[PDB]
Amino acid sequence: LLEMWLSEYERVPYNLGESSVDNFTLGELLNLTGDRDALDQLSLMNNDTHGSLRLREAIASLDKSVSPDDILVTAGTTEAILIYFKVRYRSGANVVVPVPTFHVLYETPAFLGYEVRYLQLRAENGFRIDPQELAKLVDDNTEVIVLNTPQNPSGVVCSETEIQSIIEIAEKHNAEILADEHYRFLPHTEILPSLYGLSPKIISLGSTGKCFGCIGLRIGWLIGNPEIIKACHFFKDYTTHTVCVLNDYIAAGVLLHKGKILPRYRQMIQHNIQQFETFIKQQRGLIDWVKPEAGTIAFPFFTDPNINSKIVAKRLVEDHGVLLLPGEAFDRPSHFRIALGVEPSLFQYALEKLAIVIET
């Protein structure tokens, strides 16, 4: 459903249904990172099968708990999720996935034969993970606990105490924690710290794609102990083998020049959060949300349980060209996902047309 909507309306002029920020052109990004003149001397032979040292050092430099040898660069975290769950699969294993979340986090394990146990997060509870309700789902057969923080679609950041309880549940059942830290670069602190150092059972996923305006580079990474890195590196030979030295190199300069990129998008998000709080006040209780704390998305809802966002989302895109992602893509029919990393004129235009559809 997430792919059904975002592909059918990929070319609409007012697209708020995606989770990436406004993407650069290659020339725009190179004017900020300064990596242009170095590209022509890059060899088109196979890249380092872990990713180049330049990229792994830039990733490792972000956290004192991370060293360059802990990192395996992948073609987005979509590949990293696939290889990680493949390596961890055994017969009779289950995984715990809080939902709403990115569909790949529970659909890939289902394809691989895992038993998938869902922890339904709810807006009434602030989309927060209750560790006593999480502890009900964790077996000795539970091998992976998915921890998407900042959350897609809600934007909720796990608190330090929530993390400590989840660490305790995982270590008790000897389960690993797959911490998808995609949106750590856009707090609403400069960046959120990685969870990789907090427990030996934590494996971290990261990427430049959503936060830096370069989703198309297809660069992600996995952080883990040497044994899980060796096992994932082995199986990546049967997925894509390597990523291109150019994508690798361009993403490295992005992280090394994050100060030229992330603040401008933070200001863009902060204005749009204000624009949506204005919209919530004007709607007088019809629209509410769990306020997001970090990332690129929000998951507001109609307070009337009868309204289907898909019906409102359909009329909005056909009559006005404005795309919102209906919450059915997350099994939350009253919610909808809205993109925060867009130009505020575009964000406000969408609210103005959404108001028109609400009236009529």
Ligand X SMILES: Cc1ncc(COP(=O)(O)O)c(/C=N/[C@@H](C[C@H](O)CNC(=N)N)C(=O)O)c1O
The mark string for 222-261 relative to ligand X (x by CB under 6 A, - otherwise) is ---------------x---x--------------------
3-state secondary structure of 71: strand
The nearer residue to Mg ion, 251 or 340, going by C-beta atoms, is 251
- The least distance separating ligand X from the CB of residue 355, rounded to whole angstroms, comes to 24
Cα separation, 102 vs 153, whole angstroms: 8
- Choose the one of ligand X, Mg ion, a second copy, none that binds residue 60, judging by a C-beta under 5 to 8 angstroms depending on kind: Mg ion
Unique residue bearing structure tokens 């867009």? 342
Cα separation, 35 vs 48, whole angstroms: 19
Alpha-carbon distance values, 68 to 145, 181, 242 (Å): 25, 17, 17
- Choose the one of Mg ion, ligand X, a second copy, none that binds residue 66, judging by a C-beta under 5 to 8 angstroms depending on kind: Mg ion
**What is the separation of C-alpha 270 from the centre of its chain, rounded to a whole number of angstroms?**
18
Cα separation, 360 vs 358, whole angstroms: 6
Segment interacting with ligand X (CB under 6 A) among 59-67, 75-83, 87-95, 123-131:
75-83
Tokens of 278: 């204005």
Binding residue for ligand X, selected from 15, 33, 52, 77, defined by CB under 6 A: 77
Shortest CA distance to 323 belongs to which of 24, 103, 8?
8
- The least distance separating Mg ion from the CB of residue 40, rounded to whole angstroms, comes to 30
- The least distance separating Mg ion from the CB of residue 251, rounded to whole angstroms, comes to 17
CB contact set of 114 (below 8 Å; sequence gap of 6+): 85, 89, 93, 94, 95, 144
The mark string for 36-75 relative to Mg ion (x by CB under 5 A, - otherwise) is ------------------------x-----x---------
Cα separation, 345 vs 146, whole angstroms: 36
The upper half-sphere exposure of residue 7, i.e. CA atoms within 13 Å in the direction of its Cβ, equals: 4
The mark string for 156-195 relative to a second copy (x by CB under 8 A, - otherwise) is ----------------------------------------
Binding residue for a second copy, selected from 1, 12, 39, 307, defined by CB under 8 A: 39
**18 touching ligand X, by CB under 6 A:** yes
- Choose the one of a second copy, Mg ion, ligand X, none that binds residue 41, judging by a C-beta under 5 to 8 angstroms depending on kind: a second copy
Count residues contacting ligand X (CB under 6 A)? 18
Cα separation, 119 vs 121, whole angstroms: 6
Binding site for Mg ion (CB under 5 A): 60, 66
